[PDB]
Amino acid sequence: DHALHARFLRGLACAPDRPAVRFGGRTLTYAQAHRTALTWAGSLLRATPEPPAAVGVLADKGIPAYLGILTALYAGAAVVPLRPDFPAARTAEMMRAAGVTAVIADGRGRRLLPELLADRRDTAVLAADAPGRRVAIDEGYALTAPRDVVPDDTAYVLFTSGSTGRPKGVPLSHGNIAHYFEVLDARYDFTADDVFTQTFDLNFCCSLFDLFCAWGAGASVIQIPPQAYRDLPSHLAEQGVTVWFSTPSSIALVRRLGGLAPGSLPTLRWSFFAGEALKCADTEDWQRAAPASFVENLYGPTELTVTVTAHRWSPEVSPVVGANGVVPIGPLHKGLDHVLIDAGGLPHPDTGELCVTGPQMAGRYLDPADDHGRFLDHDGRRWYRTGDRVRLAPGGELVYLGRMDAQVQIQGWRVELAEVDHALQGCEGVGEAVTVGAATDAGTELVVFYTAPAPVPPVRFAAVLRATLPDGVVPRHYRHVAELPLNSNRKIDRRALTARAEELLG
């Protein structure tokens, strides 16, 4: 009942022969997905000495990955989404940290396993289409029913950026996620007729919304493939899409390529944005394109289980509540509580760092070391510290003001500047390298300043960085300078260099 996979069962009971997934021109019904997840999880549990605590899903987005997610939950394990396009080192660190003892892998996933399992040779490997132990898949080995779980069982492991390059692992319990979907189940009105976008990559918290708002309701998630973005009206109309969820970036993209011409997106009933500052001017173009749609801004870090706020766009309210042409994030989820900590570590009635407690709070990372500075003890309760400065209005509407620290958001990608700096020490022909976030029309862009006898080809930076960093976080701006400036206490001056970055880009 608190079980994530129970939401897929709710859909199965409601809409067995309706689509649960449309992807690459293929349809997977709830019945088809159920029977395959029972087979795969049965076969897997047959092949492992113990029920695995953590199952890696090492596949591109698609049907093999969705079946893999269900298989992991059904086996009573934590889902650990892995990206075949990530550098092997990053993927290996995620599998290590998450204690992954079994991998569900597509074609592309399987090519990486010789390297990834080099000395995890134990690992069970289920093919979704000589290191590792090949799982024999047979309907004879099927579970008849999915394994039950307790609220404190880890349902998902997701990684956020770390200051030493090593990513922080967030275990989300079935209980964490059940509190989330109780709030969303009550707020929204999804039915088995709805068709939801699946724009979020499966290593990101917001993909849970796409999959489990859909599946909980008997709806379908659909592929929004790269080419749809240059004719979104035709794609949304042909496929009868009724729920949009993406980053704000996609608004500017769709407008540039195909327009966001008013009345061009009539099929949409819900339009959701999360992961970057949402601009009022962008939201208004999207509302006028999708006039039958409610438009909502959703905010939250991985550590508070996907989203903790929601603001409904109204041309009459949002710019009044909001500041600087940015749409507000909205009031805290019912059943959560916040305290605002100012820059001195003291509570403030209406302005400071947002800290959150209640059943959506993870409460820890996989590695206890990551906990330091990320939790608060106040009023006899443990709060998570977002690093996000907010203002509170009477009636509870929250406005995002900026970051307290030196973490940045590049499109949706939350990254510590220290993560990029650590990777750059590896680089050749370079004296010193420092990464800054440059405020641009597009939000924030990584820029590297570096000393050297001569400029260093971007490809040389890229070659080193791609060995440990996902491409999302690999900068495209490299500026050779004679001298890097130092501050009061003789550390490189990132304030001065952020300003120089800004004046180079706009």
Partner 1 sequence: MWDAQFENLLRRYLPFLSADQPLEQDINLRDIGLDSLGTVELLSELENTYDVHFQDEALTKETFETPGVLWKTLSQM
Q: How far is the CB of 19 from partner 1 (least distance, A)?
A: 18
Residue with Cβ nearer partner 1 (35 or 230): 230
CB neighbours of residue 87 within 10 Å: 18
Of 150 and 467, nearer to partner 1 (C-beta) is 467
* Shortest Å, Cβ 457 to partner 1: 6
- What's the closest the beta carbon of residue 66 comes to partner 1, in angstroms? 17
Residue 303 in tokens? 């550590």
Nearer to partner 1, 55 or 420 (CB): 420
Supply the minimum distance, in Å, between the C-beta of residue 230 and partner 1. Answer: 4
CB of 31 to partner 1, least distance (A): 26
How many angstroms separate the CA atoms of 338 and 360, rounded? 12
Scanning 134-277, the segments in alpha helix (DSSP H) are 174-187, 207-217, 232-239, 249-258
Nearest residue (CB) to partner 1, 229 versus 294? 229
CB of 427 to partner 1, least distance (A): 13
361/474 with CB nearer partner 1: 474
CA distance 484 to 467: 26
The two structure tokens encoding residue 241: 């899409």
SS3 40: helix
DSSP state of 322: S
Question: For binding to partner 1 (CB under 8 A), which residues are involved?
Answer: 25, 60, 85, 225-227, 229-230, 249, 253, 256-257, 411, 457-459, 461-462, 466, 471, 476
Identity of the residue, 82 or 137, whose beta carbon is nearer to partner 1 in the bound complex: 82
**Helices vs strands, H then E, count in the chain:** 14, 26
Number of residues assigned to the chain: 506
Q: Which is nearer to partner 1, 144 or 227 (CB)?
A: 227
Q: Which C-beta is closer to partner 1: that of 227 or that of 488?
A: 227
- The tokens describing 138, both together, are 């047979």
What span, in angstroms and rounded, lies between the C-alpha atoms of 98 and 117? 14
- In the complex, the smallest distance separating the C-beta of residue 257 from partner 1, rounded to whole angstroms, is 5
Measured CA to CA, the distance from residue 461 to residue 145 in angstroms comes to 51
* Spatial contact of 80 and 57, defined as CB atoms under 8 Å apart: yes
Q: How far apart are CA 64 and CA 40, in angstroms?
A: 11
Give the whole-angstrom CA distance, residue 33 versus residue 13: 13
Q: How far is the CB of 239 from partner 1 (least distance, A)?
A: 11
- Judged by beta carbon, residue 257 or residue 486, the one nearer partner 1 is 257
CB of 368 to partner 1, least distance (A): 35
Q: Provide the token pair at 272.
A: 């959701």
Question: Any residues with CB less than 8 A from the CB of 132 and at least 6 apart, and which?
Answer: 103, 113, 117, 121, 123, 124, 125
Rounded distance between C-alpha atoms, residue 431 and residue 113, angstroms: 36
Determine contact, residues 222/214, Cβ cutoff 8 Å: no
Mapping DSSP to helix (H, G, I), strand (E, B) and coil, where does residue 153 land? coil
